[PDB]
Ligand binder design. Structure first.
Ligand SMILES: [Ca+2]
Length: 562
């Protein structure tokens, strides 16, 4: 005689503590604990009294000899709004968060703080355990084929099913609606769900989605080899210091030149390139001027602090252009020029763009994500098939000798026990969302224009393919590009927003987001205390109404570009 949504019902969910039936028979509950309410903190909204359940699914040994399991953590509030929530991952996953239901966007509130039931997974591997010194550290899960499948799609499927079964037993009813919010790798997960598991979630937010993540290391090898002629000095292995190709002052000059060409193309000079399409048609660093001195951005002779050398201009132009093979066939996409490639807040230069292709300037070693960091490591072990484990010191050189006629094929290939390609299990490129749309599914995409991890133009290209394949796609899927914003957060733009509130309104009331309110997390980039702007559904952009404070969303409306 155990009442629903109670401490007794919570503790009954543990193995050997009752009658709970899990969808996957290999589910092990390690924790089923009643949690008191937690007060608000400086960085988190208050958490209601809830049941916390944590465990793992399909504990096994991989073909690499390492243990694998799909961890989950679920929190079911005693006072429940009838909604189910899953948060996405980041990086290459491998960690189990507090699972309070992050909504991204730099937000204080969690889904659990709004009385959702919330769940998270580690994706099928554990960074504390699946750490192989001969397979590039925590990307070493790529040595096991099933761990790849779990990372690609299976972990989120198993955890969604397990969460909904516990919700049904704990509350005595299924969730009215289910929601998923993820950014980066979590954005790829959201797109994967809409394509592969259309009925798992009714509302999906997919920010900066790496829906072509196996191509990232291809872009990384390209940007690495493109910036190398501008590098100064060598690291300990004799590899050119890609981080020395551009100083922070150099990048700020590039950004200021982008603003000189593109800032006013939306009708208002405000440090924000709202008209990104017009900017791409207008800006060329080989021709653009330095608006501070009126002279050309590219140096005429020797390098000064007010110009970029012709080698630098050639290098960044090639990097932004995107990778091509010998036939000239594009292998990923190009990248948009934007002011968030740099930015200055007080005396602090923005690192949020250069960390991906360049790395920190004040280092005698390469530390860019795409040169020697996690992204380059992940491609070699997780996305190349068969995997290419190596010592950590060899990664930068491996990117320098990357062959664009041979190596890109490895993301489409199968080998031995690796029976799916990395584009098979990790890719989420399908525009067949009819099952998702026709059951009432709604999807909000967002992407920062100054994202150096994944190209915002590549998300836009996906959205255009979606609208062509599905007439009237704006009725269930809308894309919100964020000028100036880096990867998932940061940069001179309005990078903070509450995506959960309009997602619920769209799914449950049919109210499509004609704009989404946003604010800047670092308004010092513009020298103000605060800046609020509307995000606009693609292809619309923000247009100043002609009067009022330029830092207040009320004085802007969404419209077609000028
Ligand atoms: Ca502007």
């Amino acid at each position: 005689p155990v009442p629903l949504a109670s401490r007794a019902a919570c503790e009954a969910l543990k193995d050997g503590n009752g009658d709970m039936v899990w969808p996957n028979a290999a589910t092990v509950v390690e924790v089923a604990a009643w949690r008191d309410a937690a007060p608000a903190t400086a960085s988190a909204a208050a958490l209601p009294e809830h049941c916390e359940v944590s465990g793992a699914i399909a504990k096994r040994t991989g073909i690499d000899g390492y243990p694998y399991e799909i961890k989950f953590r679920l929190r079911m509030p005693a006072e429940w709004n009838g909604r189910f929530f899953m948060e996405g991952g980041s990086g290459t996953n491998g960690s189990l968060s507090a699972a309070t239901g992050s909504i991204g966007g730099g937000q204080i509130a969690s889904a659990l703080s709004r009385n959702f039931a919330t769940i998270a997974t580690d994706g099928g591997h554990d960074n504390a355990v699946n750490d192989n010194p001969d397979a590039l550290g925590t990307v070493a899960f790529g040595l096991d084929p099933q761990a790849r499948l779990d990372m690609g799609y299976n972990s989120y499927d198993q955890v969604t099913q397990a969460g909904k079964a516990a919700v049904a037993r704990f509350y005595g009813r299924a969730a009215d609606k289910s929601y998923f919010i993820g950014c980066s790798e979590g954005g790829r997960e959201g797109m994967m769900l809409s394509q592969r598991f259309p009925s798992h979630y009714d509302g999906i937010v997919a920010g900066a989605p790496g829906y072509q993540l196996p191509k990232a290391g291809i872009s990384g090898a390209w940007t690495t080899q493109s910036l190398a002629p501008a590098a100064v000095g060598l690291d300990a292995q004799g590899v050119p210091l890609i981080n020395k190709s551009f100083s922070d002052a150099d990048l700020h000059l590039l950004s200021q030149a982008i603003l000189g060409t593109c800032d006013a193309l939306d009708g208002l000079a405000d440090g924000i390139v709202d008209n990104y399409r017009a900017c791409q048609a207008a800006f060329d660093p080989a021709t653009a001027a330095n608006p501070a001195n009126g002279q050309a951005l590219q140096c005429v002779g020797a390098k000064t602090a007010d110009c970029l050398s012709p080698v630098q201009v050639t290098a960044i132009k090639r990097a932004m252009a995107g990778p091509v093979n010998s036939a000239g066939t594009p292998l990923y996409n190009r990248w948009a020029w934007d002011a968030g490639m740099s930015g200055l807040s007080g005396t602090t230069y923005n690192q949020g763009w250069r960390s991906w292709w360049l790395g920190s300037f004040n280092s005698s070693a390469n530390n860019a994500q795409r040169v020697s960091g996690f992204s380059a490591r992940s491609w070699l072990v997780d996305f190349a098939t068969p995997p290419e484990p190596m010592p950590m010191t060899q990664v930068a050189a491996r990117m320098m000798k990357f062959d664009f006629d041979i190596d890109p094929l490895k993301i489409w290939a199968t080998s031995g026990q690796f029976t799916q390609s990395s584009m098979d299990w990790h890719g989420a490129t399908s525009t067949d969302l009819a099952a998702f749309r026709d059951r009432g599914g709604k999807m909000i995409l967002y992407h920062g224009m100054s994202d150096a991890a994944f190209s915002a133009l590549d998300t836009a290209d996906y959205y255009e393919r979606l609208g062509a394949a599905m007439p009237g796609a704006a009725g269930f899927a809308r894309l919100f590009l964020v000028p100036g914003m880096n990867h998932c957060s940061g940069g001179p733009g309005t990078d903070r927003f509450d995506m959960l509130t309009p997602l619920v309104a769209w799914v449950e009331r049919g109210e499509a987001p004609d704009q989404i309110s946003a604010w800047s997390g670092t308004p010092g980039y513009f020298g103000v205390a605060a800046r609020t702007r509307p995000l606009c559904p693609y292809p619309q952009i923000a247009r100043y109404k002609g009067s009022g404070d330029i830092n207040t969303e009320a004085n802007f409306a969404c419209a077609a570009p000028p």
